[PDB]
Design a binder for this molecule. Sequence first.
Ligand code: AZD
Ligand code: AZD
Ligand code: AZD
Ligand code: AZD
Ligand code: AZD
Ligand code: AZD
Ligand code: MG
Ligand code: MG
Ligand code: MG
Ligand code: MG
Lengths: 150, 150, 150, 150, 150, 150
Amino acid sequence: VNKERTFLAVKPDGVARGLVGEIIARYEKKGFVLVGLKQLVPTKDLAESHYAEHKERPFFGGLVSFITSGPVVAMVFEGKGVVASARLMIGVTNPLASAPGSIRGDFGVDVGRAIIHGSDSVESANREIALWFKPEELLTEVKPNPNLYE
Amino acid sequence: VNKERTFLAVKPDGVARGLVGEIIARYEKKGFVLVGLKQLVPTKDLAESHYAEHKERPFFGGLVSFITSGPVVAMVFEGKGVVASARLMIGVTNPLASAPGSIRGDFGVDVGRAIIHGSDSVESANREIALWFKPEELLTEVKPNPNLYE
Amino acid sequence: VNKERTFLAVKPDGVARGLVGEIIARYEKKGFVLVGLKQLVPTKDLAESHYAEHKERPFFGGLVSFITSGPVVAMVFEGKGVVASARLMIGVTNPLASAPGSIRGDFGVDVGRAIIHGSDSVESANREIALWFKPEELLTEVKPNPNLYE
Amino acid sequence: VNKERTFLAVKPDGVARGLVGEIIARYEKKGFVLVGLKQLVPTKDLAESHYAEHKERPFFGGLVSFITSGPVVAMVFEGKGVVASARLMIGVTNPLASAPGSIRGDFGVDVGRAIIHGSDSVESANREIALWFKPEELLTEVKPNPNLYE
Amino acid sequence: VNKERTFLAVKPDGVARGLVGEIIARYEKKGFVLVGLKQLVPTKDLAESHYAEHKERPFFGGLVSFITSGPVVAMVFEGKGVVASARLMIGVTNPLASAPGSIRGDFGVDVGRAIIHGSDSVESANREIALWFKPEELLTEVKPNPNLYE
Amino acid sequence: VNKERTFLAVKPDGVARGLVGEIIARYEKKGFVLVGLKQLVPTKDLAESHYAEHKERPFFGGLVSFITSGPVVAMVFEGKGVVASARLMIGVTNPLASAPGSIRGDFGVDVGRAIIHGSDSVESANREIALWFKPEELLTEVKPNPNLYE
Ligand SMILES: Cc1cn([C@H]2C[C@H](N=[N+]=[N-])[C@@H](COP(=O)(O)OP(=O)(O)O)O2)c(=O)[nH]c1=O
Ligand SMILES: Cc1cn([C@H]2C[C@H](N=[N+]=[N-])[C@@H](COP(=O)(O)OP(=O)(O)O)O2)c(=O)[nH]c1=O
Ligand SMILES: Cc1cn([C@H]2C[C@H](N=[N+]=[N-])[C@@H](COP(=O)(O)OP(=O)(O)O)O2)c(=O)[nH]c1=O
Ligand SMILES: Cc1cn([C@H]2C[C@H](N=[N+]=[N-])[C@@H](COP(=O)(O)OP(=O)(O)O)O2)c(=O)[nH]c1=O
Ligand SMILES: Cc1cn([C@H]2C[C@H](N=[N+]=[N-])[C@@H](COP(=O)(O)OP(=O)(O)O)O2)c(=O)[nH]c1=O
Ligand SMILES: Cc1cn([C@H]2C[C@H](N=[N+]=[N-])[C@@H](COP(=O)(O)OP(=O)(O)O)O2)c(=O)[nH]c1=O
Ligand SMILES: [Mg+2]
Ligand SMILES: [Mg+2]
Ligand SMILES: [Mg+2]
Ligand SMILES: [Mg+2]
């Protein structure tokens, strides 16, 4: 029952830097199956729900203004431990402190331009998924590479 | 014209082999802008209209049954000469005969498993674009990297 | 010592996923010299001796039946600290927990489909080396790139 | 009956340039299955049989002296049209006239250091295979990625 | 002979697009040695003198203006037939007509934002090498990669 | 702030191994701007003065000797926290102890053939930038990639 899922989002800086394919491929190479994928310009109301936990933090206004200043490519990968692994692959919050080899470690320098958002726990994935995805935009079931699993 | 567009779709064989990131990355590095993107499972009625021009050929069914066997990730890129460049980057119809450096030449072997589709003319791109996407699913304030165009 | 050696073997899951070139390329770029290389289908008697140290564990059979289900490409690299570096490059036992940049962290997800084997000590490399190869199957006049060593 | 095979060989310059993995991966990425693989230091008598057609040409002596001055990694790939495709992927005889994207096009400059030998026709593959490979060193049959073929 | 040389210049759009490392690496992988390298901002005298074979042409005015607008990393490579070879690796004048695998064909879209300049013949090269470099800024005699030439 | 700067030097073994393009590209992909770049052959005064914090150390003698033996492509990058960040991307002193993903960990094997030097702090950097570069060989004020900083 390795149908764990996560919500990852390439943000407007990651989008404008011509980084969408590099990020998807890191995950496809790992073994994760893409069950949902679309591009959209986030609305103020999704931007604020999405990042609800930072409503009072200073940078909030600055963050919300950004995630809606342009196209974001939202996606949800599935696979065993996909949530903690995807987080590991992204790096940490400050891109300057991310180990070389992680998405932020190889491409970011400013927390303000973090390139990609990755859900931090199953509970939040679920919240963020239902939030960005109508039920029909998600694939129900299919086969991942049979060499990944037992 | 800098706002010409083409429709591309990574096929079931491309998605499954883990080539969605690899393929998007080449159009991005080329400088093309992704103005529409989404994954889905095509329906019999979508695939027939799509490959309409081959309505009666020895392999129509086998192709219509293939493009429906799994997820496709549709996309539209915009930029100068995108339709014709996108075609050069894809290769020729038979993968084996496509040169190294092209998508079909690097990854393909069978005409049946051609990995990706690309509009062949601007008449078919405007037609195929209209076929897979809705008008609110495409971007508008589009500013490609400031160093690509003079 | 510049002539230390380790034994590595791309597993059935690695060969099948098309990772033999990717994996050899990292040891070559690292500067290690390939002094023995070959592909084969392991026999029950080869695999048991190989994974001898796990003779009695809940997953021995499933691992011995896996390493025999297809081709493995065995190899031995020589160079300073090859055994320990080769281990760092591979990752930790569980792929999900391996960091990005390492072989198991970039491509692996399951402990059962660990992609590659690496000797853990020089006692086991000399033992595993002797296990898979014959003495006339390894090189002698070995001159690594002149810019790697002082 | 797409069990066509070819014999490719990374020569001592390709070997010493740390190029073995890059070449194998180009073919694994394409869809070809590795059915045989080993490393050896070619003997004068295999060097001369192998390149029998150039016995009288001037550069012969110079070629044979080279292909035996070091390790060669011999391999045989299988797949539809693998012979003409592998040739296409290698480039032409003069590396300076090879299109960027082909093995020789991206890495060679001297016909004398051509990096890789690829059989030029089925008839010669068969001759070159039996020549470098004992029957047991070759895998008999297994499954290539099912997305490559119909 | 293998001591031929060519002048390559990564133009303002290549520099700003972050392609300097990608370009230098294609040439290094090829076998050419870097004998000169520097970043400078060109001045008019130099630009008009460099782009003299086009003085009486329509697009002229803009050529000099754009190449004077920012950083250019100039370089000269040495190698057997490096002048004709570098040009092939670059592609043709229009980036849209250039093939995937070449620099302009992989990353370019506009004739006016062609990314890199490369001498078109030996006469033009020894001339251009002289305009951008003082004789002490160029290596005298090198020890190329040992396995490149016969 | 984001106008911090660091001195990076690809050492004789990096240059000879053909890694200059790979190294420059890791930094460009990261977000840093190249403000200085040149290849030169260091002279004793410069080497001893550069490697002064090690004068009274055992390996000293050899350091100066080796870095004077061939071409070095010196460079300085500017970016937010570029000094601490470049160092992390480099790895630690011993290449065998460096992690995959870092420059030394991916390509290095010997402490004495460490491939690249990178300033260890801002004080050391502004000092070293001064030793290798004349003030006119460095860009004054740049227009970095627009989507890197907040
Ligand atoms: C701490 C902090 C975060 N942010 C941004 C970084 C994130 N962008 N993304 N993705 C976003 C959310 O912060 P976060 O949840 O602390 O970081 P993450 O979970 O590692 O992404 O705020 C900011 O702009 N300024 C700050 O001071
Ligand atoms: C002519 C031909 C096409 N097809 C497939 C290959 C394509 N898949 N994709 N993309 C699709 C359309 O055929 P096509 O339009 O001739 O090929 P393309 O324009 O070069 O894509 O039919 C086939 O299976 N066998 C054939 O002989
Ligand atoms: C401990 C453990 C190992 N295995 C597998 C993973 C390995 N495949 N490879 N390489 C092999 C050996 O286990 P291991 O020796 O503990 O792992 P490694 O040294 O890090 O390779 O057993 C398993 O399937 N399940 C387990 O829980
Ligand atoms: C024409 C020519 C070939 N050679 C080398 C190039 C080849 N090395 N390999 N592989 C080998 C065989 O020549 P070939 O069969 O003409 O070339 P290929 O089939 O494209 O490989 O001779 C040479 O050294 N000098 C020459 O003048
Ligand atoms: C002839 C031509 C060139 N240019 C640009 C393209 C080149 N960019 N560079 N380097 C430069 C010189 O033109 P070119 O010599 O025709 O092309 P190149 O030798 O392949 O570079 O002007 C253009 O603006 N329009 C034209 O029709
Ligand atoms: C301390 C140390 C360094 N060196 C080498 C490694 C470095 N190569 N570079 N650049 C250089 C300076 O040593 P270092 O400052 O300890 O390491 P670095 O700052 O990480 O480079 O001497 C060595 O020979 N042995 C040692 O123990
Ligand atoms: Mg968060
Ligand atoms: Mg078509
Ligand atoms: Mg083990
Ligand atoms: Mg031949």
